[PDB]
Amino acid sequence: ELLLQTNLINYVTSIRPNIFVGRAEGSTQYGKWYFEVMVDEVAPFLTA
Amino acid sequence: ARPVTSPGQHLLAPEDVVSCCLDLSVPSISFRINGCPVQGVFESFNLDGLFFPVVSFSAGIKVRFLLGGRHGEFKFLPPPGYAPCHEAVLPRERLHLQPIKEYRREGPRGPHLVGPSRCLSHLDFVPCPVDTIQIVLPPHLERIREKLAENIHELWALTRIEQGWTYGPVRDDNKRLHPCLVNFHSLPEPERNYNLQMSGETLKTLLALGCHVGMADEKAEDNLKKTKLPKTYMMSNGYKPAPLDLSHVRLTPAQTTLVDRLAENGHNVWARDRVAQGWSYSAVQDIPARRNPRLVPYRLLDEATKRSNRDSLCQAVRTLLGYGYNIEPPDQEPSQVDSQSRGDRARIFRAEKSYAVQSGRWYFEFEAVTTGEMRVGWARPELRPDVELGADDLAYVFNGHRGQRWHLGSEPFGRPWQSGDVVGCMIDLTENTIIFTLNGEVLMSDSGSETAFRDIEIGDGFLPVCSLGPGQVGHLNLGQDVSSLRFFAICGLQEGFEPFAINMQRPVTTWFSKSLPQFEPVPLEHPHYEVARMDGTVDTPPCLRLTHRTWGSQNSLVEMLFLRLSLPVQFHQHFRCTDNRDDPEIILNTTTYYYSVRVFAGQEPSCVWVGWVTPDYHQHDMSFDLSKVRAVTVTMGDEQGNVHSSLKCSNCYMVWGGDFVSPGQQGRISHTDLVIGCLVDLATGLMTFTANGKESNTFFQVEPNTKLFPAVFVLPTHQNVVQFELGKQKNIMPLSAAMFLSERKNPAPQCPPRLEVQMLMPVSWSRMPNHFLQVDTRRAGERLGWAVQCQEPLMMMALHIPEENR
Amino acid sequence: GVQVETISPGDGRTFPKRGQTCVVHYTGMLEDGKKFDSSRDRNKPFKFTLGKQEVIRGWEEGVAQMSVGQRAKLIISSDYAYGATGHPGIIPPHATLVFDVELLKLE
Amino acid sequence: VGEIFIYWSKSHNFKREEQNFVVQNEINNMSFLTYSVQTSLIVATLKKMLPIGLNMCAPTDQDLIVLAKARYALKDTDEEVREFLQNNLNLQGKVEGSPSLRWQMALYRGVPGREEDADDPEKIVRRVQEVSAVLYHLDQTEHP
Numbered sequence A: 001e002l003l004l005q006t007n008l009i010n011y012v013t014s015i016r017p018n019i020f021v022g023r024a025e026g027s028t029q030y031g032k033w034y035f036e037v038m039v040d041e042v043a044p045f046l047t048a
Numbered sequence B: 001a002r003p004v005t006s007p008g009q010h011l012l013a014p015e016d017v018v019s020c021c022l023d024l025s026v027p028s029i030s031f032r033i034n035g036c037p038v039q040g041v042f043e044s045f046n047l048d049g050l051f052f053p054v055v056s057f058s059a060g061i062k063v064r065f066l067l068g069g070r071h072g073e074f075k076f077l078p079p080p081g082y083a084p085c086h087e088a089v090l091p092r093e094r095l096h097l098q099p100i101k102e103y104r105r106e107g108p109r110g111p112h113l114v115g116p117s118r119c120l121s122h123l124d125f126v127p128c129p130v131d132t133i134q135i136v137l138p139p140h141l142e143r144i145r146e147k148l149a150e151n152i153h154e155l156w157a158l159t160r161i162e163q164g165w166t167y168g169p170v171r172d173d174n175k176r177l178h179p180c181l182v183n184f185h186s187l188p189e190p191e192r193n194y195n196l197q198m199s200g201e202t203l204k205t206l207l208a209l210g211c212h213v214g215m216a217d218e219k220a221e222d223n224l225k226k227t228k229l230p231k232t233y234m235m236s237n238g239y240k241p242a243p244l245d246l247s248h249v250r251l252t253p254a255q256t257t258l259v260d261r262l263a264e265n266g267h268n269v270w271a272r273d274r275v276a277q278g279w280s281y282s283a284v285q286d287i288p289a290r291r292n293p294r295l296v297p298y299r300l301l302d303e304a305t306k307r308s309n310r311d312s313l314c315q316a317v318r319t320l321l322g323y324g325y326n327i328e329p330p331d332q333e334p335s336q337v338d339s340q341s342r343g344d345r346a347r348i349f350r351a352e353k354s355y356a357v358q359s360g361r362w363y364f365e366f367e368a369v370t371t372g373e374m375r376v377g378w379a380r381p382e383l384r385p386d387v388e389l390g391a392d393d394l395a396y397v398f399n400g401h402r403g404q405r406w407h408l409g410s411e412p413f414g415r416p417w418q419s420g421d422v423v424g425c426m427i428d429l430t431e432n433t434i435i436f437t438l439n440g441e442v443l444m445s446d447s448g449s450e451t452a453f454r455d456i457e458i459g460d461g462f463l464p465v466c467s468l469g470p471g472q473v474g475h476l477n478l479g480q481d482v483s484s485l486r487f488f489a490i491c492g493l494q495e496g497f498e499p500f501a502i503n504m505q506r507p508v509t510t511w512f513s514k515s516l517p518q519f520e521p522v523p524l525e526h527p528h529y530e531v532a533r534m535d536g537t538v539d540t541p542p543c544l545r546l547t548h549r550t551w552g553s554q555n556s557l558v559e560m561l562f563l564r565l566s567l568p569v570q571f572h573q574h575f576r577c578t579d580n581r582d583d584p585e586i587i588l589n590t591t592t593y594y595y596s597v598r599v600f601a602g603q604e605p606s607c608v609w610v611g612w613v614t615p616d617y618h619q620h621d622m623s624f625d626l627s628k629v630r631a632v633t634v635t636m637g638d639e640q641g642n643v644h645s646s647l648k649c650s651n652c653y654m655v656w657g658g659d660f661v662s663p664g665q666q667g668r669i670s671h672t673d674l675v676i677g678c679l680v681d682l683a684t685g686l687m688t689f690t691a692n693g694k695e696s697n698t699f700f701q702v703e704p705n706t707k708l709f710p711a712v713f714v715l716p717t718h719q720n721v722v723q724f725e726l727g728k729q730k731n732i733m734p735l736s737a738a739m740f741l742s743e744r745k746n747p748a749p750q751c752p753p754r755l756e757v758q759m760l761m762p763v764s765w766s767r768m769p770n771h772f773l774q775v776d777t778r779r780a781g782e783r784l785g786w787a788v789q790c791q792e793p794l795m796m797m798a799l800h801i802p803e804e805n806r
Numbered sequence C: 001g002v003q004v005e006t007i008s009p010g011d012g013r014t015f016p017k018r019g020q021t022c023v024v025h026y027t028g029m030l031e032d033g034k035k036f037d038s039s040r041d042r043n044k045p046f047k048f049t050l051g052k053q054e055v056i057r058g059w060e061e062g063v064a065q066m067s068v069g070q071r072a073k074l075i076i077s078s079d080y081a082y083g084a085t086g087h088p089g090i091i092p093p094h095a096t097l098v099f100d101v102e103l104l105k106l107e
Numbered sequence D: 001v002g003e004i005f006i007y008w009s010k011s012h013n014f015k016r017e018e019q020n021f022v023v024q025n026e027i028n029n030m031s032f033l034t035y036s037v038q039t040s041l042i043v044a045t046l047k048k049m050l051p052i053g054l055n056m057c058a059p060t061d062q063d064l065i066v067l068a069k070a071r072y073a074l075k076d077t078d079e080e081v082r083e084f085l086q087n088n089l090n091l092q093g094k095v096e097g098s099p100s101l102r103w104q105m106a107l108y109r110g111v112p113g114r115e116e117d118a119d120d121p122e123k124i125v126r127r128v129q130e131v132s133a134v135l136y137h138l139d140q141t142e143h144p
């Protein structure tokens, strides 16, 4: 808790489709939305 | 991470299908794994923005977004009422995968630096037409109301038949059948009434927008001649549209602008009416479901629809002009938007401080991929991240949007750039000059001088720097590969300038102005805010008092201020299961700690929030209020409902000073200080508050191991703003006993040097990684969806500050 | 103690038996989440023989319940971990340990 | 243009008559470019054309240029300088000596034709002599 701590960590990034939904009074946007993600390959421990 | 139960629990593995459903009405977010419900939900979260699907990952993954329709066939049926996400793509957009808030990209000749992205808001989907109910039509406009009502339908039916629409029993688009393509006086009652009201609304908005219009002709009124449409434009039932011919009516530019405004207002009125009736937007039209592809505010509409609406409104304006009315456009009233703070908007990218050059002749290039707000030049190592480039004396830059040289202000210089133009920046530290070239030609000032700046004091050196505004893209070439420079040979090589990174074995490291608010110690020389450390007296505990130095004077800065104490208090790992002189046993066995905030008389309690923040608080909200606090409830239950737990998570636990102002005192400046005390039981997770010794109704519950910083948010209204009092109460320990292990059993209040006041700073310098994850996104197919792949590992050595959990 | 919570399933059949050498990959953290050990950092699986009292009791029992190829989180109390003495300089006294153990193989 | 500028620098009636012409005719040298020896069109045109002259000399010839400038400072004649360079061509710079020469000569060879030429001692001496004379007289002009 006193000395600075070091460690090797993975870089993490995010990806989104250009789909934006929200709610507001008088808004023209639908309120219920649904999507899916299918996982094809995952290397659990590509690094440490 | 909160464990959630699902059949066959396992970390996401190949062939797994995760279904995510968002119901904004509750609001709630629910998950399903391989069709099985995930026994847990997010709910009661903030709704001030737009939600998007997102997947986060490290290297070694391959996933596919399934959004329905032709963008990924769902493997499981959406729950009833939920819409496929592909329907949410906006009219003027094409569905694709993108990163979030990227300051950097790849490009044909190297990395491209990217400025902030212009984001839509949830309020951008609310149509806001101009209010026209009180606009009573003057006699002339009232008279023309019906004629417009008929003529609009005439023109619309002519266009319908020209584009193919023919009369029929029902709206059969497949057979091109329209039931409403008849004479207006015979049009179905509902549509006729709507057309009539819209026709009147056109004149009404004409008046409301500020136009001055009245009769100026009757001879023309009786002279206008109607077009005779042939059998080809005749309907299946024999109906023939009658759009009056007015080929003698010309137009003016301001009138075209007003036509655009009228089209906007009309579309917004229609959208508001449809939303009231219960319609919504959808990329695919569904009339039974009341989903339309055009039910969006005019600004977001597609170009073709905008053109059609503008053409119709221009025809209406022409009809009025042909009637002879004097449609006079209103004067233009200037206004400002400044969506955000300019000083913190543009992203600044600079070379690392260690690359500062204190001598020689140095050259580099900056290609403007866009043509908007961008600045490029040289900066001193101590350049601030929250100041516009060249606003102060710490940078000499050129802005090519209009052509200006920036240093301690702006001056005309050079010429504006075009897309793909390369600005060559040169610094000569022997002559103490700075030169700018555009596509190899030296840019010159109005006086004709060929040096942008002169008499430059070397000081600590100079670094390449650029600034990109929202939506801007640049390409910084520091010349590591001399052959990559495009105009070095034309200008600079023979002049004796050297590429900035000519003989570097590695690319030059860069830093950027990250706009993530962070807490930093109050500067000892801050022009507006001063913090005084007051020692504890016999009747007073240790205190940290904030004062506004420049209050009640010209240049005074009055804005929301977010303060916290440097050290946190940490709740215990395990919570307990289920005179005025301290009693020694109680005071040495207690786990409750206390700290107060004094709001001095003259500082409005309605402008003060007192409490705690977690390490995660990063909101620099200039209009802060307790309703803006991030919050979310995680609810876990059984496979048959039966909620097990409902944990509330937030990053700001505060009370509002306005809750302790008596209604009698409301509206009057009190002459008494308001003392708000905060108590935290580190062994139970309970947080309570008191006002002037009276217990308040606000209470909070946090989970074990939580870290809380004492915090105060205040909008100053007096020279003496607030005071952190690190005192104690009867049988309650001071904050020092919780903060410092050596003082764990010491009841004497203390304020060691480490404990200090920090303020929230909107922008900070952050080092850009030398290498970035290579992510590949592509449309796998109409059934497979959109594939994201990342295979090459990438790691960094992270330095972690324990107390700040950063 | 020791609680075993599966992260990724194993074969479900092959469980370690006394005298067999378990080859595993693990990462160890304290209850508050501070990492203190990892065989993946050294890039070499850790091998230990069941019943020889080579590792802590929590590890013995948890890996005994684990199956070949399985990844699991072991939550080990102080009594099943270094207890009151702790590991001077590494693990504080009376510390609950959390391990992310993958049973690579048996030999 | 360099020869004309050299004549201007050497002769003194040239400068005086240029000044008289500009003062009398009230010619706007600033407008021409877009009273002051800086605005003198004679030196301005030479300064504008100088990059072309420098582009003829290879980076290696920089030392020979310095030696020729030193001679012209010693008031040697053109033939004297042309013989000095002819007889100490061996003082030509070597790329290995400096890292700057490496990339300078890399660019020079990358430029087509420049690498093809500059293999002739007569060409080298002529280039160095002319450019060095121009640079010397530019130094005299800039110096007050």
Ligand SMILES: Nc1ncnc2c1ncn2[C@@H]1O[C@H](COP(=O)(O)OP(=O)(O)OP(=O)(O)O)[C@@H](O)[C@H]1O
Binding pocket: B152, B153, B156, B180, B191, B195, B198, B266, B267, B270, B294, B305, B309
């Ligand atoms: N996309 C739109 N933009 C602007 N105004 C619209 C739009 N859609 C409908 N309106 C308004 O509603 C009216 C509907 O069109 P119109 O009255 O010409 O015929 P309709 O037969 O009632 O409509 P539809 O074209 O749906 O058959 C338009 O005149 C206009 O007043």
